[PDB]
Amino acid sequence: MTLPAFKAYDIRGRVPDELNEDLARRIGVALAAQLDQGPVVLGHDVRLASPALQEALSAGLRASGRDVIDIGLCGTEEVYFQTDYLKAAGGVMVTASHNPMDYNGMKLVREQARPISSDTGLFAIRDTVAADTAAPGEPTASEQSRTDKTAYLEHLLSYVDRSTLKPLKLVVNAGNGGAGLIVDLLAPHLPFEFVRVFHEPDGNFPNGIPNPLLPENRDATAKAVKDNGADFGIAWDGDFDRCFFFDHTGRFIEGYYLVGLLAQAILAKQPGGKVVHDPRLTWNTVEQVEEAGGIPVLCKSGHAFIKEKMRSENAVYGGEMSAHHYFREFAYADSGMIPWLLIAELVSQSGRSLADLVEARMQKFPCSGEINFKVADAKASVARVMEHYASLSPELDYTDGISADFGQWRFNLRSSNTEPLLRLNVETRGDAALLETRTQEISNLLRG
Ligand SMILES: [Ca+2]
């Protein structure tokens, strides 16, 4: 067959049958063969098995003559940042994301933190690994421990004017992932009053695997915001490349609205810039970008597509509705830290609460959120939807699945390639009733 752990965009599998130290070592050998010259940055998340997987990567890389820069326990964005900042040949983050306790994985980048994906080197690595029966060589290169975060912290702080920040009270919820370490290193340089929830890194996850999208986990941040009168709350996934916002009422802010909000924050600092966004939910972003003087650039969803498009357009910022925010100055990479710093600055400077910054936008472009449908036949299910609506003559766009614009409402319907699974997003022009009736109509068709 093929090694199942090699996915479209990263490596992910059950330990030890899909991913283990031997495979990790072979991946390091294969990665050395795929990169231009230079050292390789390695970091890892809080999962208990992550360090051993990193050590195996390092052994394979060093056997292949690659100097290894061990940045230690970190966030995925720190591997991206250090790979670019240190002008490394590439980098690997060992991270299991929100997969089960017996899973782990790896995210791999080349120069400037450019993604390595299935069609840009990852399956080449897979095929090399799959055929590698060579004896493990011994190291011919060194490993250096580089735990200085100064340049990374200075870079994060460079997105805000610290003299304009107010002493907001912010709930922070690392979910026992790694975000608290960075929050605590930033805190001496900021005026905020932090309320720390599930703050200590703990790969045993006594409070659940970090995933702020699950209602039980969502509610822990909401409750802390409400009980403490916080201005807003921020939660992260375990490797903290995704952040999640809760307004002063405890309400979780759907990620769609953060794209337009962050674009308007960034466009104040880089006037006339291009902003890349995905096709699932669009109308609010296009309007907010244009109103702020930027140029919106439609792009297929998925971090590799977003990053490539930002590069080709010199786009200052790119944002996906699914809590991914990318910054040109950050090597075009995603950060779960930059967004909350920008939002805290916007609340501080504007005098407006996070709730009021988004309220009118959510009313003007209400959306369904992303709704997933396991179906027996994705192609037949999409066909049923498109047949049902054909007589309305929607404007169709095929940038990412099917987008259908009917005038006062639109949807995007995307099909998973890993399993028969359709993802639906609907939005309307200020009409909650139409949003629900159309969402339910499409849902009935997809389940047919
Ligand atoms: Ca993540």
Author numbering: 1 to 448
Relevant lines from the article:
The α-D-phosphohexomutases are ubiquitous enzymes found in all kingdoms of life. Among other reactions, these enzymes catalyze the reversible conversion of 1-phospho to 6-phosphohexoses, with various sugars including glucose, mannose, glucosamine, and N-acetylglucosamine. In bacteria, the enzymes phosphoglucomutase (PGM) and phosphomannomutase/phosphoglucomutase (PMM/PGM) are involved in the biosynthesis of exopolysaccharides that contribute to the pathogenicity of infections in higher organisms, including humans, animals, and plants. The reaction mechanism of the α-D-phosphohexomutases is conserved, and entails two phosphoryl transfers [Fig. 1(a)], with the initial transfer occurring from a phosphoserine residue of the enzyme to a monophosphorylated sugar to form a bisphosphorylated intermediate (e.g., glucose 1,6-bisphosphate or G16P).
To obtain phospho-enzyme crystals, the purified protein was phosphorylated with G16P prior to crystallization and crystals grown at 4 °C to limit spontaneous hydrolysis of the phosphoserine. Overall, the structures of EP and EdeP are very similar, with a Cα root-mean-square deviation (RMSD) between polypeptide backbones of 0.26 Å. A small shift in the backbone between these two structures is evident in loop (i) and several other regions near the site of phosphorylation [Fig. 3(a)]. A structural shift of loop (i) between EP and EdeP has not been observed in other enzymes in the superfamily, although only a few have been crystallized in both states. In PC1, a distinct separation is seen between the two apo structures (triangles) and the ligand complexes (circles). This variation is the most significant in the data set, consistent with the obvious conformational change of loop (iv) upon ligand binding.
